[PDB]
From a paper:
The Delta and Kappa variants of SARS-CoV-2 co-emerged in India in late 2020, with the Delta variant underlying the resurgence of COVID-19, even in countries with high vaccination rates. Herein, we report cryo-electron microscopy (cryo-EM) structures of Delta and Kappa variant S protein trimers – both in the unbound state and in complex with the ACE2 receptor – to gain insight into how their mutations underlie changes in ACE2 binding and antibody neutralisation escape. Within the receptor-binding domain (RBD) of the S protein, both the Kappa and Delta variants share an identical substitutional mutation (L452R) with the previously emerged variants of interest B.1.427/429 (Epsilon). Finally, the P681R mutation (present in all B.1.617 lineages) immediately precedes the furin cleavage consensus sequence (682-RRSR/SVA-688), with initial reports suggesting that the P681R mutation enhances cleavage, and consequently S protein post-fusion transition.
Numbering used by the authors:
A (entry chain A): 943 to 1041
B (entry chain C): 299 to 620, 641 to 675, 691 to 694
C (entry chain A): 14 to 69, 77 to 145, 155 to 176, 185 to 247, 257 to 298
D (entry chain A): 745 to 827, 856 to 892
E (entry chain B): 992 to 1041
F (entry chain B): 745 to 793
The structure:
């Protein structure tokens, strides 16, 4: 558990990708989660409704994923700015700042 | 790039413009090698049907089924299908088919539907709300009517509780509609449960005998037996093809797989819940469905003040599926590769950068 | 032909631990190197499984409920257990299911059998007395033979949507008396489109004749409940471990 | 690949363009972060072949010539200890170039102290 | 009607969790600043102006 | 306590799990913030009487 911070970031990104892929398995109230099954089973007047339900569910999932990606990007940017400050002040010079 | 950025002047850099995906070439349909036709004739062209309280169910499996024979023939007044399109039924495969045949009156033809009420729906024949199939009703005046009354077709009129979906009730017990026990004798407040239609050919179109056949298709996870009349094509591998394997439709590259399927398993699936392996219906061969090459197109350019020359990067796409240079970032077209190292001007990725001096990478 | 067996010894049936047995493949889909959560009719871990004996004078053929589903375990040597009876009233009024495994093949028949009070088979050291009649038969299926205690037979019988799912696993063991502690996922054996109501079931045994003698065998009956399992699929697609989601807080 | 689905998706406007723009901004921000952290020197410093540092041993932090990855033993241990329309863009700086940047920083801080960070 | 109530309450809860995450990021930045002041002003004498 | 409402809520999937996980992350982040700010010493010192 020495390297927990990097493994935490990798696990969070992998879990977000797995959740986004997993959200395709949900039908969001439609008859099926597979677009090809709906297109091969139904006429376009009702397949339009089923595809619309799938589109709004997947779009909400994708917007949610982008929202947490932006929040994690802000957190990683703050950590990277801290790392750049430590590289400038601790490696390239001797720092009088305590701890 | 100018259209994407909504500007007539493009600054120096890399810009994501569109996405590239290789089109499918062929279409490969693989169905099991069966030839025998299952008796739709014995279901539809039977001499005598059954009453609706004792509706006749026939199990249909292991056949080629031509549904457009039933569709295009001008003999059925109602061919109304729920959960599936009637024209598309030739292009689908189902595990089992239930054919439920009975005889009702014309006004009761509407009652054969999910979420409907009446005497037939409550007491005689109930359809589940997740019903997938077709209801096929046609007039039968010459067969099921007789001058003086045809009383051999009975419907259940009295029951304590409504029927469950696909429940068959053939019991004949005297319905107790009051407090007095009936003891098997009809009389005051004690009725027989079965009531005769009493068909005559002079009756109205509402009181007219209609023969109804309900086809219900089991689309559950099982080996598929009933399949349409679509002809199987030969298997082509290592290319991007549309495929229809036993009614399972997709687009991908079919290759050899080292996955040892257990003999009861047809499909394969991964942690991403995607069908990445299937069993061939004919050769019993397990095929890995690798999805086809795709990525983003990036237009590497200097400023339009400097030059109008551009290069294109296909991200994560090998150069043989699209001044050609293969990078880890993708295939780069239009930029010459040099062995000299300079500072990064336009970043490509994976240690690769581009500059203008022609466009070099 | 029916024969009353009047030389039985009265004894209550026993109970023992299920351990981590009774896990079957929930579907026909290949999965590899994955952890899959499924909610289905499963046998709970460490449950109270009923134990019946055949030893000489014990001959356990009682009337048992079927409920949602039945897990059937058999510590068997020398092939005494031959088949099962399923139905509701076990007479000609209703329609009943017969599964037998004689010396040649496995026969499944769905008929209105007028069953005997004590249905049994016999081996002479050529005897079959199970039903007296069979009038209306809808389904027939002839297949291959499925089969110190040396052999362990696990079966799972389920009846959903008119489909009878039989899951089977054959295990070489060398444990004398009880269920071995371990894990073995039951592969599906057969899916039968019987479409009949089942609430009661019977075990079919075989007598040994020169009265009668019962060979040494033991079987276990457990009942399935709807619950969630977390199954682990290895690189070869074989279920190697399972977690009962509602057993204890650690597994939860 | 459904054309009808994309036609219905076009009714919602430029949501997909917005999401792609946000992801592109994040992707270039990661490369900017790596440039800000590791690319603080424009000279690639190298250690002398003779490791005479007055008794100080830096073999565990200097790159190993015997390894093909040109990583330090500590960096090699660190790399060993860390384990449908989605694409992964490669980083602009690869692992060997980041290791080369760290090696240059190590050579600068060993051979020159803090003088290389303020000038020659 | 229950579906309308469910989607309205779910949208409200997602909005609440999103703004809570934004406030958590702000409080985390303030707490990192406070930890820096604890290390540099209390545990030592700082040459940094203001 | 409405079971029909929960049955309809199950159609939307694992939204509730995501909200609980985000709130759990915020809750442990607050304790981490207090730990970083105040617990900078492992010796509990006292002034002389
Ligand atoms: C074996 O025993 C059972 C029960 O002890 C017998 O079943 C009974 O038979 C009598 C005589 O026909 C009937 O009056 C009873 O109604 C039966 N019991 C039940 C519960 O139905 C059975 O007949 C015996 N077998 C033989 C061959 O005699
Ligand atoms: C610096 O440290 C390294 C590692 O501790 C020393 O390398 C060891 O040298 C001894 C004797 O030559 C060997 O037995 C070990 O196997 C070496 N270990 C490794 C990991 O290489 C090295 O001698 C030290 N001194 C110098 C000047 O480099
Ligand atoms: C029933 O018989 C008629 C004979 O004219 C035939 O045209 C029709 O196709 C038959 N129906 C079926 C389902 O075979
Ligand atoms: C028919 O399919 C079977 C698989 O069940 C296969 O073994 C056989 O070779 C096939 N025959 C032909 C002529 O394709
Ligand atoms: C099993 O049930 C019997 C009675 O039904 C009981 O005496 C026994 O203690 C139970 N065993 C376990 C392990 O629960
Ligand atoms: C099945 O049988 C039991 C008892 O034999 C009965 O209570 C139940 O209603 C039956 N179910 C059906 C669907 O016939
Ligand atoms: C086993 O049973 C089947 C059908 O019941 C029969 O045809 C066969 O002869 C039987 N074999 C023996 C050895 O009794
Ligand atoms: C079942 O068998 C009895 C007697 O053999 C017969 O009277 C009855 O009609 C049969 N039922 C069916 C549905 O064939
Ligand atoms: C999987 O199968 C291979 C044989 O190809 C075998 O070597 C390996 O041990 C198996 N894995 C497990 C976990 O049994």
């Amino acid at each position: 558990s020495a390297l927990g911070k990097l493994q935490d970031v990798v696990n969070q990104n992998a879990q977000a990708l797995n959740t986004l892929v997993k959200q395709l398995s949900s039908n969001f109230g439609a008859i099926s989660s597979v677009l090809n099954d709906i297109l091969s089973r139904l006429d376009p007047p009702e397949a339009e409704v089923q595809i619309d339900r799938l589109i709004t569910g997947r779009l909400q999932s994708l917007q949610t994923y982008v929202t947490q990606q932006l929040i994690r990007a802000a957190e990683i940017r703050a950590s990277a700015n801290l790392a750049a400050t430590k590289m400038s002040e601790c490696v390239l010079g001797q720092s009088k700042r305590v701890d | 790039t100018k259209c994407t950025l909504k500007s007539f002047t493009v600054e120096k850099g890399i810009y994501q413009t569109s996405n590239f995906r290789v089109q499918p070439t062929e279409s490969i349909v693989r169905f099991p090698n069966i030839t025998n036709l299952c008796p739709f004739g014995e279901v539809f062209n039977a001499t005598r049907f059954a009453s609706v309280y004792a509706w006749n169910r026939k199990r249909i499996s292991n056949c080629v089924a031509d549904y457009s024979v039933l569709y295009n023939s001008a003999s059925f007044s109602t061919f109304k299908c729920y959960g599936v399109s009637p024209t598309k039924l030739n292009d689908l495969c189902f595990t089992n088919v239930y054919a439920d045949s009975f005889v009702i009156r014309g006004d009761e033809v509407r009652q054969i539907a999910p979420g409907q009420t009446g005497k037939i729906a409550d007491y005689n024949y109930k359809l589940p709300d997740d019903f997938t199939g077709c209801v096929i009703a046609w007039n039968s005046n010459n067969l099921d009517s007789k001058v003086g009354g045809n009383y051999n077709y009975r419907y259940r009129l009295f029951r304590k509780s409504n029927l469950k979906p696909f429940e068959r009730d053939i019991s004949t017990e005297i319905y107790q509609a009051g407090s007095t026990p009936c003891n098997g004798v009809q009389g005051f407040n004690c009725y027989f449960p079965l009531q005769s239609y009493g068909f005559q050919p002079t009756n109205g179109v509402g009181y007219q005998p209609y023969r109804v056949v309900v086809l219900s298709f089991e689309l559950l996870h099982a080996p598929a037996t009933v399949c349409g009349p679509k002809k199987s094509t030969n298997l082509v591998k290592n290319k991007c093809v549309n495929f229809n394997f036993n009614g399972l439709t997709g687009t991908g590259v079919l290759t050899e797989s080292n996955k040892k399927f257990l003999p009861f398993q047809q499909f394969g699936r991964d942690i991403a819940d995607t069908t990445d392996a299937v069993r061939d219906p004919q050769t019993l061969e397990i095929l890995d469905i690798t999805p086809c090459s795709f990525g983003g197109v990036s237009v590497i350019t200097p400023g339009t003040n400097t030059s109008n020359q551009v290069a294109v990067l296909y991200q994560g796409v090998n150069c043989t599926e699209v001044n050609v240079f293969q990078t880890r970032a993708g295939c780069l077209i239009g930029a010459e590769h040099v062995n000299n190292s300079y500072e990064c001007d336009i970043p490509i990725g994976a240690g690769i950068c581009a500059s203008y001096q022609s466009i070099i990478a | 032909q029916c024969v009353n067996l009047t030389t039985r010894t009265q004894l209550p049936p026993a109970y023992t631990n299920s351990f981590t047995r009774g896990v079957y493949y929930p579907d026909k889909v290949f999965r590899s190197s994955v952890l899959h959560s499924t909610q289905d009719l499963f046998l709970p871990f460490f449950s109270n499984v009923t134990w019946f004996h055949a030893i000489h004078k014990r001959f356990d053929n009682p009337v048992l409920p079927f409920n949602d589903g039945v897990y059937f375990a058999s510590t068997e040597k020398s092939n005494i257990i031959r088949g099962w009876i399923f139905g509701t009233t076990l007479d000609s009024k209703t329609q009943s299911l017969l599964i037998v495994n004689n010396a040649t093949n496995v026969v499944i028949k769905v008929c209105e059998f007028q069953f005997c009070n004590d249905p049994f088979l016999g081996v002479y050291y050529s005897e079959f007395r199970v039903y007296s009649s069979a009038n209306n038969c809808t389904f027939e299926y002839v297949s291959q033979p499925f089969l110190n205690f040396k052999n362990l037979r696990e079966f799972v019988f389920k009846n959903i949507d008119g489909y009878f799912k039989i899951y089977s696993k054959h295990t070489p063991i060398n444990l004398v008396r009880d269920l071995p502690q371990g894990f073995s996922a039951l592969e599906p054996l057969v899916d039968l489109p019987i479409g009949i109501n089942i609430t009661r079931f019977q075990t079919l045994l075989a007598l040994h004749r020169s009265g009668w003698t019962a060979g040494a065998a033991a079987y276990y009956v457990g009942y399935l409940q709807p619950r969630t399992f977390l199954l682990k699929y290895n690189e070869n697609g074989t279920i190697t471990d399972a977690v009962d989601c509602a057993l204890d807080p650690l597994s939860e | 690949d459904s054309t009808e689905c994309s036609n219905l998706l076009l009714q919602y406007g430029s949501f997909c363009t917005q999401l792609n723009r946000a992801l592109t901004g994040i992707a270039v921000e990661q490369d900017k972060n790596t440039q800000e952290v590791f690319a603080q020197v424009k000279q690639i410093y190298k250690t002398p072949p003779i490791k005479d540092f007055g008794g100080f041993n830096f073999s565990q932090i200097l790159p190993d010539p015997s390894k093909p990855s040109k990583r330090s033993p500590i960096e090699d241990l660190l790399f060993n200890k860390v384990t449908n329309g989605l694409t992964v863009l490669p980083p602009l700086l690869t692992d060997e170039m980041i290791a080369q940047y760290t090696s240059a920083l190590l050579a600068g801080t060993i051979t020159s102290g803090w003088t290389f960070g303020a000038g020659p």
